[PDB]
């Protein structure tokens, strides 16, 4: 069970937004301009790390 | 510095013809694209046609037929070829050769056309 | 760098990561004409960035 949970939160953590707009890479990046797409993608970065 | 000897405009009746031609003298380079540009009597530039260094050309007007480039690659003159002269073409022309780095631009000669 | 624009897409780009600097300043006494300056020509059509 211990195994498993951890696996599960492991996963489940992807769809956090950790302060940024949005938790998908690839609407953020199409959505923005690439000063503030990095600023976005450096906090996605910096909470999945 | 460039210089770009305009010769060939003047008074011509309807459906007369005359040689309008420039040489670029200077400091030029290697692609050298050049043209001609229209300015009517207190309206905007348009461009005329265009001649390339390939011998491509690209006229910017429906006047195929009226005028037509010819290329000096020897001395790298351009002339154009006025024929079936109407009033509406009276403006002032001005050969521009684009270039590689630095535009430039001609003085400027006066076609005139009317009956 | 990193601006989406017709000039910046057609005519003139600038990296992401560009150091140095620009410098602009009006020119009405010298690059404008009453009958209107035109010397100076952009481009608007273009088929790629």
């Known amino acids: 069970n211990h195994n498993a949970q951890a696996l599960n939160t492991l996963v489940k953590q992807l769809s956090s937004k950790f302060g940024a707009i949005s938790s998908v890479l690839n609407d953020i990046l199409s959505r923005l301009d690439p000063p503030e797409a990095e600023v976005q993608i450096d906090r996605l970065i910096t909470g999945r790390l | 510095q460039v210089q770009l000897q305009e010769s060939g405009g003047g008074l011509v009746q309807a459906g007369g013809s005359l040689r309008l031609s420039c040489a670029a003298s200077?400091?030029?380079?290697?692609?050298?694209?050049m043209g001609w540009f229209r300015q009517a009597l207190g309206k905007q530039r348009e461009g005329v046609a265009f001649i390339s260094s390939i011998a491509s050309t690209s006229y910017w007007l429906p006047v195929k037929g009226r005028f037509t480039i010819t290329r000096d690659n020897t001395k790298n003159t351009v002339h154009l070829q006025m024929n079936s002269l109407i009033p509406e073409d009276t403006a002032v022309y001005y050969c521009?050769?684009?270039?590689?780095?630095?535009?430039?631009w001609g003085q400027g000669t006066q076609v005139t056309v009317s009956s | 760098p990193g601006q989406t624009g017709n000039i910046a897409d057609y005519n003139y780009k600038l990296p992401d990561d560009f150091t140095g600097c620009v410098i602009a300043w009006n020119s009405n006494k010298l690059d404008s004409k009453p009958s209107g300056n035109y010397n100076y020509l952009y481009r608007l059509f273009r088929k790629s960035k």
């Open positions: 200077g400091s030029i380079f290697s692609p050298n694209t």
């Open positions: 521009y050769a684009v270039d590689k780095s630095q535009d430039y």
